[PDB]
Amino acid sequence: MSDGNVAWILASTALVMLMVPGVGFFYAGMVRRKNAVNMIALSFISLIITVLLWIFYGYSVSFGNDISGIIGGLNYALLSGVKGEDLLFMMYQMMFAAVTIAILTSAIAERAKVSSFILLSALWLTFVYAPFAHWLWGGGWLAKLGALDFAGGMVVHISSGFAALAVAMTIGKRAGFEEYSIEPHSIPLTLIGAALLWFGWFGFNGGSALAANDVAINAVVVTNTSAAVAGFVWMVIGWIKGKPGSLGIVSGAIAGLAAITPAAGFVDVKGAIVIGLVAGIVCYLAMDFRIKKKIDESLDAWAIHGIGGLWGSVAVGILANPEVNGYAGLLFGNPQLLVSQLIAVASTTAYAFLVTLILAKAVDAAVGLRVSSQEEYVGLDLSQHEEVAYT
Amino acid sequence: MSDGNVAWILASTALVMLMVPGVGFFYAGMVRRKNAVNMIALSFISLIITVLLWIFYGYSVSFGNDISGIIGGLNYALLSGVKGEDLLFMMYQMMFAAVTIAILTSAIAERAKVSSFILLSALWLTFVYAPFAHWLWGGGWLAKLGALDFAGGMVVHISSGFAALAVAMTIGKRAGFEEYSIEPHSIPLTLIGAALLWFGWFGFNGGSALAANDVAINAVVVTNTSAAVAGFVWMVIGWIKGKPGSLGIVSGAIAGLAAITPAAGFVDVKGAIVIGLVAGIVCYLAMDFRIKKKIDESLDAWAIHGIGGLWGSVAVGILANPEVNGYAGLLFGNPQLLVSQLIAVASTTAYAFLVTLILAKAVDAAVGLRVSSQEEYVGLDLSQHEEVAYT
Amino acid sequence: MSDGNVAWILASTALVMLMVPGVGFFYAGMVRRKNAVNMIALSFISLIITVLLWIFYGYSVSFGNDISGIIGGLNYALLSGVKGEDLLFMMYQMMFAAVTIAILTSAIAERAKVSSFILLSALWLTFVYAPFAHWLWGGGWLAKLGALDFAGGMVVHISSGFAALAVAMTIGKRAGFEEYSIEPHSIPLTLIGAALLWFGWFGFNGGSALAANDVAINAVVVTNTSAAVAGFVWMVIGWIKGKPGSLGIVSGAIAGLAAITPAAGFVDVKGAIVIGLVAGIVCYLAMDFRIKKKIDESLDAWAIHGIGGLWGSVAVGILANPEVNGYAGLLFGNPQLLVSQLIAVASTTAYAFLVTLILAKAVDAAVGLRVSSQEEYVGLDLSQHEEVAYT
């Protein structure tokens, strides 16, 4: 099976797994000390829950027998019939689902009931993520009409970004959100998360070629490129607006990473530069806009992932270079690919937001999403975990 | 040599190395601020010491010429005659020894003399670890009677777990251990350790197939499975008993990882589920029991690793699936394998505990294990390292 | 292309990337709380800046058409003409440049203008790093006269070490440097950095064979060996001088890692032992000496990397074992190799220091390197990033 290829995907799988708690640390540093444990705990729970559901039926529903091009059957439930390298694919994919759910925790920072997050995550995974994976990567209707998503610009970034937006609006602003700014308790903790995410993204985008070949090498080159450009952009904006805080820098780098994900295996270095440059700009604008509109989509999963993933997914249709991976975009003489991406982006963006909104409200009405005011006041570490982050 | 296979083991080696300080961070967060540096420092020392002894003679004693099936000769001392991929095996194995010693530091948390830990570690490595590795993986008498241990359920988890129990009883309870509970100074630090351990375990269990093949893929699948189940279990117990603290969650995940280690390459996903489920339960019971018996085996190396490794090692004899890796357990028609595991588990459990006990007391009588009361009072960071963790 | 080999280098690339922020954490823990964000931020900026310049022309200047053996042309500017595995080489090499620049941040700890660091880094990369890479690895005049540097004893360690010395002397001592000692705000943060650096060095030295073969395995064995020896040495010195602080231990391990880098693929385990032993000693002496001379080369990039890299690079000429990788040193009957190393070390040491000195003063005169006294007083987190590390 080419031990080399298995080697690379085994490694890439470990890398993506690390990104789950990586997300937890990244977010934890930006919340208050009284909610640090909760923010990290959520990423671990996301992992645990994801692994179980994925095995149970998640994998089957995403990549099993296709039914009307919208979803898969239960032929792979409990991994029945999954052998050899399909098992490696399953495991690798399982980690993409886990990171997505963790990113989503951005919208419930500092005020959600853990039990409720679990219920909603299980439902979201079932009714939003699995479907997307199937549409694009499981031979679903989107792949059928020619849509492409190399590493998850849509399956992962658009889904969590817009789902995060829907969730934030449903759960409401944190107490005092509007009055005074919420300061991060540990920027260094966040920076550790950021280093783990950049590092893990090597397996995320580079592993998506499913082999140790020229496409993975390209994905690795362009991934690092877009990240650097988008990070540089936020740095400049930082200076333009005052001082370049470390948060803006890494946030910019992450915008570039999310934007390049859907295209990592189709574009050249020049294309990666445009994507990163534009990503840095539009994502920063989205942040200020959601801030202007007073939406407490707390850690900007939407501005960064939602908008970054949306852009990158569209950019695939404009800059795909056939010399790179056969596929060609508008600038390389193919208008058709652009239309496929727009349809794919319009569909996944609307569905992620609208369905998440339905799910969020359903659960809210069923069990209630938000913690009580006093718990929010004392912090979820104590109230939801009966723990104290530091002594 | 299949560059793919070398690639995977080179990577798996780096992964296991990371687990050493990973253990240090995991433990450090659960001790008091005045002992944070010491707890981490111990894991680095474990690494340094292990590497030296392993090269000097540790490797030879573990995998050299067999003498009476209990130990190896000195033909590989200073790596004399070790070439090509035997060198990669040596290096990979060296890291297993280092992690084991680090896990063991659980029993001496906050009150041991560094110099003494080194002496004892050197002796333990020599008289307990090397022998075990040889019995099971060096063509020793246990492998000879058909015993199996895929990734170290016995060589690593049972050994450190029970050795930790012996050490704790010999060194005694921390001052005030019984009166008031000792709070962790940094749960987030512990969670970083936990993420590094989960991530590193990909190389630990996945690398144990010694190749990038179907067995490693299986080991990776089942490893993640058992961890998720055992973590889910502790989460439920947490709710049943109040609130699911992040510590219980990751502690549960680690119980599943330790339990699955001896079996990662022999069982199917259904088997992994049973192992994780049972592991979560029995390990939690072991924790409460050692707590009930007032034994200051501080960070539960015993409850988690000892008991988790014991269970998993036995489970190998019940659930080994021949369709997975040829070997078959009791449930797959082979009673013989179960007997081999019981004998192996009875032997390694008794030896680890009894011999460690002899070694711990010997050193105690020779140089003294525990620091003075005042050092314990001011903290080992200052007293043993003349450092202060934070300012 | 041997998927195995690509697999290993893709992984090694991710590993070296991690070492960049790893350096940031390592350094951040040793500075004051008011400068924690700045110290880490610098490592991320180093990465971002490096990636951009490397793509733009850095790579071409290092490995493009040779001009008079001192530098490369612009034929690979913007990666024009770089395809297949040359692209993987490019990306892997790009990360070596990034780590070098991060190491260098040691000399400007707590008192530099970010804008100025960027300018100087861009110039240093252009006029010092690229040239070195070309001399030794780009078919430059040094490789031509038979000089060797397996993983960068000179290209990375000597360059940053001596450049750091030049920079420190040009920027001046931190306020109060002489009066009272500057305490590290978070040793644990530093220890996390150290674990990431040790782990990442697997890709650094092990990946330098450019394939998953016997040389990489050897590099991995010897790398871990020298680190352990040098760390053990500093530990002993620590006891001899009082208590073995964790900082000395990891600092010693890093001396061994830097010393072994230029030789990782040419020496045997016995040679690795001598190198580590000597490295621990000479590097510790260099630290005390620069401390005696009152030079605020803050985090000892010079004592550790400069001197460690200098030693190891020379040691290559004494201990290269032909049985290991064909090349042979003085002790293996070849005086010639020793002369090549001395010339290479004399040249790179003098150039790094002298040219960096010119660059540092130029920029200082152009825009000014150091922040104002009051910024230094309130801390660069607030003054240069308008952020606060912890709340």
UniProtKB/Swiss-Prot annotation, chains A, B, C:
Main location: membrane
Recorded effect of pH on activity: Transport is pH-dependent, with a steep decline at pH values about 5.0.
One of the record's GO molecular function terms: ammonium channel activity
Topology in membrane: Multi-pass membrane protein
Coiled coil: none
Annotated transmembrane regions: 8-27, 39-57, 90-106, 114-137, 153-170, 189-208, 218-237, 246-263, 269-287, 301-319, 338-363
Membrane topology, Extracellular segments: 1-7, 58-89, 138-152, 209-217, 264-268, 320-337
Site (Twin-His motif. Important for optimum substrate conductance): 157, 305
Pfam families: Ammonium_transp
Compartment list: Cell membrane
Cytoplasmic side: 28-38, 107-113, 171-188, 238-245, 288-300, 364-391
InterPro entries membership: Ammonium/urea_transptr, Ammonium_transpt, NH4_transpt_AmtB-like_dom
A GO cellular component annotation in the UniProt record: plasma membrane
Annotated keywords: Ammonia transport, Cell membrane, Membrane, Transmembrane, Transmembrane helix, Transport
Description of how the protein assembles with itself and partners: Homotrimer.
Family, similarity comment: Belongs to the ammonia transporter channel (TC 1.A.11.2) family.
NCBIfam families, A to Z: amt
Function: Involved in the uptake of ammonium/ammonia (NH(4)(+)/NH(3)). Transport is electrogenic. Transport the ammonium and methylammonium cation with high specificity.
Protein name: Ammonium transporter Amt1
Organism: Archaeoglobus fulgidus (strain ATCC 49558 / DSM 4304 / JCM 9628 / NBRC 100126 / VC-16)
Gene name as annotated: amt1
